[PDB]
Write a protein that holds these residues in place. Structure first.
Motif, short mmCIF file in Angstrom:
data_model
loop_
_atom_site.label_atom_id
_atom_site.label_comp_id
_atom_site.label_asym_id
_atom_site.label_seq_id
_atom_site.Cartn_x
_atom_site.Cartn_y
_atom_site.Cartn_z
N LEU A 165 -5.37 11.70 -4.31
CA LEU A 165 -5.33 10.87 -3.11
C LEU A 165 -6.68 10.31 -2.72
N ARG A 208 0.84 -1.88 -21.30
CA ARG A 208 0.85 -1.32 -19.96
C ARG A 208 2.26 -1.41 -19.34
N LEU A 247 -0.84 -4.99 -6.73
CA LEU A 247 -1.57 -4.15 -7.70
C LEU A 247 -1.85 -4.71 -9.09
N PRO A 284 0.79 -1.24 0.00
CA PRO A 284 0.00 0.00 0.00
C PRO A 284 0.82 1.29 0.00
N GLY A 301 -7.19 6.53 -3.28
CA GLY A 301 -7.39 5.98 -1.95
C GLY A 301 -8.74 5.34 -1.76
N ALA A 343 -10.01 -1.82 -11.41
CA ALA A 343 -8.87 -0.96 -11.64
C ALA A 343 -9.03 -0.13 -12.92
C1 LIG Z 1 -6.65 3.74 1.20
C2 LIG Z 1 -5.34 3.36 1.85
C3 LIG Z 1 -5.39 2.54 2.96
C4 LIG Z 1 -4.22 2.14 3.59
O1 LIG Z 1 -4.30 1.33 4.69
C5 LIG Z 1 -3.10 0.74 5.21
C6 LIG Z 1 -3.39 0.20 6.61
C7 LIG Z 1 -3.67 -1.30 6.48
S1 LIG Z 1 -4.85 -1.89 7.74
C8 LIG Z 1 -4.09 -1.36 9.30
O2 LIG Z 1 -6.09 -1.21 7.58
O3 LIG Z 1 -4.83 -3.32 7.67
C9 LIG Z 1 -2.99 2.58 3.12
C10 LIG Z 1 -2.91 3.41 2.02
C11 LIG Z 1 -1.54 3.86 1.56
C12 LIG Z 1 -4.09 3.80 1.37
C13 LIG Z 1 -4.03 4.67 0.16
C14 LIG Z 1 -4.37 6.03 0.22
C15 LIG Z 1 -4.30 6.78 -0.94
C16 LIG Z 1 -3.89 6.22 -2.15
C17 LIG Z 1 -3.53 4.87 -2.20
C18 LIG Z 1 -3.08 4.27 -3.51
O4 LIG Z 1 -4.22 3.75 -4.22
C19 LIG Z 1 -4.14 3.27 -5.49
C20 LIG Z 1 -2.91 2.90 -6.03
C21 LIG Z 1 -2.87 2.43 -7.34
C22 LIG Z 1 -4.02 2.31 -8.08
C23 LIG Z 1 -5.25 2.68 -7.56
C24 LIG Z 1 -5.30 3.16 -6.24
O5 LIG Z 1 -6.26 2.51 -8.46
C25 LIG Z 1 -5.78 1.86 -9.65
C26 LIG Z 1 -4.24 1.84 -9.49
C27 LIG Z 1 -3.56 2.88 -10.37
C28 LIG Z 1 -3.27 2.41 -11.77
O6 LIG Z 1 -3.18 1.11 -12.14
O7 LIG Z 1 -3.11 3.30 -12.57
C29 LIG Z 1 -3.61 4.09 -1.05
#
Ligand SMILES: Cc1cc(OCCCS(C)(=O)=O)cc(C)c1-c1cccc(COc2ccc3c(c2)OC[C@H]3CC(=O)O)c1
Ligand SMILES: CCCCCCCC/C=C\CCCCCCCC(=O)OC[C@H](O)CO
Ligand SMILES: CCCCCCCC/C=C\CCCCCCCC(=O)OC[C@H](O)CO
Length: 434
Positions: free
Chosen positions: A127, A412, A163, A80, A131, A171
């Motif tokens: 974000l 990709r 991912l 993540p 997110g 996605a």
């Molecule tokens: C939502 C969240 C939750 C989170 O919990 C961690 C705690 C784990 S526990 C304690 O709960 O067990 C940690 C993080 C970092 C986040 C987060 C926040 C903001 C953005 C992103 C990235 O999100 C994407 C990354 C790529 C992609 C995304 C989203 O969509 C498609 C593709 C992109 C592509 O292929 O072009 C994560």
């Protein structure tokens, strides 16, 4: 059509190794500029530098993934953090590039709080978007009630994937939508600004600024280079060897006992009268009129310049050049004028006027505002190029595989590599190195 895993690795490592110093230098330049002045462009460049540095720092993880042929060879809990560090910049970068090119365009074509708000919005969008989709719909996400780590698919036993094995049904719409908003729209903004910068240069000045540059400004009577009494913005008072005759013509032309000294307002008034006279001299001369009428704006100014300096009859003697100019034979005209006594007597100014005849631009007149407009064009042009070359293929891949999910993963993969090289090409185009 698969890259060897070593080639992918090497390509990511090269982008990392170069991108880290480049973006540290870019951030520093941008930070020194804001802190000293504080301008929109600096804010956008700072955000672009930080985001590229974040992308850069994620690249070693993408590199080892490549070496593992797509498998995730790191702790699952890192996935993540990698997700956000890698893809947030990959989308935010285009937004900042467009903002920078628009700031440069507007600042130069039309010469703080906004900037920061705009950047906050870009960050907020990227974000929340990434997110919310990730938090909700990634494997291990809110909707997943399984024993899965967040962001990890396991297509076969012992082969976790961060991912990239994510269901395209989740996605794809997320990628697609954000690529439209944060790449294709910025691309169109950047192209628009680039064109705007060019047009701004084409018509970014005029005869008045051009002659001010060529003639300068004196408030007291002085002798020009030939030794004649002159005042203001190259206003010849008389050819006569007599200061008194010069004072007398000065006083006559203004309406006051000047005693050989004038204000800047008065000098400016005379200058206006001299340019009108030079223009009227052209329009009442049978040799000059048709040439002037056939010319674009920038070359008219050059012709006015010559007449201001030498008078209508002097300029009308250049029969061959004039003919050339009417025939739009620019270089031939220049070759003729270079042989003139004029070129011999005042070669810096003559080169500037003649170059203006050859090119039809204001490039020979490197004024502060012209260079700012040039700077802006280069930045928007560089931005356009890096958008099309680097993150472009990635975002086009997002669009293509959404519209044509029959497409394989090959495009990709390559788009991700070109996207990673934005950390190298971005700091090189934004203009904040050193
Ligand atoms: C939502 C969240 C939750 C989170 O919990 C961690 C705690 C784990 S526990 C304690 O709960 O067990 C940690 C993080 C970092 C986040 C987060 C926040 C903001 C953005 C992103 C990235 O999100 C994407 C990354 C790529 C992609 C995304 C989203 O969509 C498609 C593709 C992109 C592509 O292929 O072009 C994560
Ligand atoms: C405002 C919220 C924006 C979030 C939407 C994301 C969509 C991405 C598209 C374009 C980003 C670039 C937009 C152009 C910003 C340039 C503004 C500018 O030139 O600033 C000069 C000065 O601050 C003026 O007073
Ligand atoms: C100016 C840019 C505008 C950007 C906004 C357009 C995004 C639309 C995407 C919808 C996904 C839904 C697809 C569902 C198909 C399955």
């Amino acid at each position: 059509m698969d890259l060897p895993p070593q080639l992918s690795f090497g390509l990511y490592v090269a982008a990392f190794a170069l991108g880290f110093p480049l973006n540290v230098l870019a951030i520093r330049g941008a930070t020194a500029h804001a802190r000293l002045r504080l301008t929109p462009s600096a804010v956008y460049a700072l955000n672009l530098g930080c985001s590229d540095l974040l992308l850069t720092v994620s690249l070693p993880l993408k590199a080892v993934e490549a070496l593992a042929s797509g498998a995730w060879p790191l702790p699952a809990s890192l996935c993540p953090v990698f997700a956000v560090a890698h893809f947030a910049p990959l989308y935010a970068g285009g937004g900042f590039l467009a903002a920078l090119s628009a700031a440069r365009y507007l600042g130069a074509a039309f010469p703080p709080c906004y900037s920061w708000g705009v950047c906050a919005a870009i960050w907020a969008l990227v974000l929340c978007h990434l997110g919310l989709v990730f938090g909700l719909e990634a494997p291990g996400g809110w909707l997943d009630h399984s024993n899965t780590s967040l962001g990890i698919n396991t297509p076969v036993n012992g082969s976790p994937v961060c991912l990239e094995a994510w269901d395209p049904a989740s996605a794809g719409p997320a990628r697609f939508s954000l690529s439209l908003l944060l790449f294709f729209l910025p691309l169109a903004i950047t192209a628009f600004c680039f064109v705007g910068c060019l047009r701004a240069l084409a018509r970014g000045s005029n005869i008045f600024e051009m002659l001010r540059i060529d003639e300068g400004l004196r408030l007291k009577i002085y002798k020009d280079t030939e030794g004649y009494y002159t005042i203001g913005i190259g206003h010849l008072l008389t050819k006569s060897p007599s200061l008194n005759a010069a004072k007398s013509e000065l006083d006559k032309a203004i309406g006051r006992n000047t005693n050989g000294v004038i204000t800047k307002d008065e000098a400016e008034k005379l200058f206006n009268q001299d340019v009108d006279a030079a223009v009227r001299g052209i329009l009442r001369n049978a040799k000059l009129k048709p040439v002037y009428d056939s010319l674009d704006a920038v070359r008219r100014a050059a012709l006015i310049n010559m007449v201001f300096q030498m008078g209508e009859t002097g300029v009308a003697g250049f029969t061959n050049s004039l003919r050339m100019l009417q025939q739009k034979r620019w270089d031939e005209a220049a070759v003729n004028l270079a042989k003139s006594r004029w070129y011999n007597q005042t070669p810096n100014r003559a080169k500037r006027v003649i170059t203006t005849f050859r090119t039809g631009t204001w490039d020979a007149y490197g004024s502060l505002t012209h260079r700012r407009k040039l700077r802006a064009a280069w930045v928007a042009g560089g931005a356009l190029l890096t958008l099309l070359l680097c993150v472009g293929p990635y975002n086009a891949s997002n669009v293509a595989s959404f519209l044509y999910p029959n497409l394989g993963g090959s495009w990709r993969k390559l788009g991700l590599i070109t996207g990673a090289w934005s950390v190298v090409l971005n700091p090189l185009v934004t203009g904040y190195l050193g």
